[model samples]
Target: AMTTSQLRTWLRDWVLATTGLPAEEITDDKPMQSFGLSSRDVVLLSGELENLLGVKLDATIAYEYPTIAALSQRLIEG
Candidate 1:
């Protein structure tokens, strides 16, 4: 079982590798694309993030949770 802490770091690197962090006021509503991840990216990334150490999931996790903290717990426990 992956701990939330471990998952957080995993997600942190996975996201930060995109294009660094987004500024709340820099782009428009923290543009998702600013991270270089597109619609397909989110879907695919969701699979990995979910499968990193858990059961079934969907792209919903990508948008719905919207945070490593939340996502990690859901991924590990769900």
Candidate 2:
């Protein structure tokens, strides 16, 4: 089982890689769209998360959760 901090780090790294932003600039409570992620980016990110976590997730999971802490909690509970 992945810890919440681990998931947070993964999300932060993903945002950094995808958006070319510094990791320290990412906030766990901030909305992903605040990083300028498009719908396609959200889809791809959800897909990658599913693969990495080996769990089924909706395509709109990113938008539905809207933040790293929320998304990580959803995955942990699901």
Candidate 3:
């Protein structure tokens, strides 16, 4: 299982990379909409996560969580 802190770092960096957002600005609870992630971004993010984490992510996971906190939690659960 992945640690929360590690997940936080990974998710923050990934979301920022995909959305062109800043790592400092990403919050666990902040909605992804605030960070400017679109459906296309989600798809790109899913692919990246699969490559980086070596785990296949649900294509709709981004929409389901819509927040860094929630997404990290899900990732950690696996």
Candidate 4:
């Protein structure tokens, strides 16, 4: 499993890349959907995270977790 710090960095970078947002604009507590993530975005990110973390996650996981911090905590605890 990835460390929490690693997960957070990956999440932030992914959001940055996908949204074309500056690093300062992506906060951990901000809802990912606020970054304009569609259902397809959620599903694709979920698949990538599953591969990265070796965890099975629902495609709608982002909708449930909502924020990078929340999702990272879920992965750590799950």
Candidate 5:
């Protein structure tokens, strides 16, 4: 398991890389779908996260959690 903030930072950096959004606007409350992640993007992200956390994750986990804060907190509990 990862710390909530650490996971959030990893996610934030990834969202930064994947989207054109400026760093300041990538808040924890924002839905990942809002970052213009297509189904393929979500799948890639899920796979990357599985590697980062070393666990199996739902392919649609981004849709399930929807926001950085929610996902980070939930994954921290795993």
Candidate 6:
């Protein structure tokens, strides 16, 4: 399993790549779309996460864990 920081970094990159935002601008608490992400971007991000982590995610993951920090915490806890 990936460490927390590694997972977070990868998440940041994935979000940035899909949203066309600079990686440096991404922060833990910022909502994905508030940083210029869209719903499609989130979908793509979820797909990427599943591909990289080898775990399927439901729509609720995005709803329940809105921020990068919270999602990272969930992954760590799980």
lDDT of each structure?
0.64, 0.88, 0.77, 0.85, 0.87, 0.74
Write model 3 residue lDDT over 1-78, tens digit each, in one string: 568778777878777777776667787788877887777877777777677667988987777777878877777686
* Residue pairs in clash, model 3: 28-69
lDDT of 5 at 37: 72
Clashes of 5: 0
Off by over 4 Å in 1: 20-36
Which stretch of 10 consecutive residues in model 2 shows the poorest summed lDDT? 17-26
Question: Please, what are the lDDT tens digits per residue for candidate 2 over residues 34-70?
Answer: 8877789889998998999998889999899999999
In angstroms, give how far residue 35 of model 6 lies from its true place: 1.7
Task: List the candidate 6 regions with Cα displacement exceeding 4 Å.
Answer: none
Tens digits of per-residue lDDT, candidate 5, 1-78, equal 569999999999988898778998798997677788778988888899989999999988888899999998878886
Score candidate 1 by TM-score against the native. Answer: 0.67
If scored against the real structure, what TM-score would every candidate get? 0.67, 0.91, 0.76, 0.90, 0.91, 0.79
Candidate 1 per-residue lDDT over residues 1-78, each given as its tens digit: 768788777766777665466533223224344466667767878788656755677776667766566776677777
Against the true structure, candidate 2 reaches a TM-score of: 0.91
Q: Which candidate wins on lDDT?
A: 2
Q: Which residue pairs come into collision in candidate 5?
A: none
- Tell how far residue 65 is off in model 4, in angstroms: 0.5
- How many pairs in model 6 have backbone atoms within 3 A of each other, for residues 3 or more apart or on separate chains, i.e. clashes? 0
The deviation in Å at residue 66 for candidate 4 is 0.6
Residue 33 displacement (Å), model 1 = 8.4
Question: What is the Å distance of residue 13 in model 4 from its true position?
Answer: 0.4
Runs in model 4 lying further than 4 Å from the true structure: none
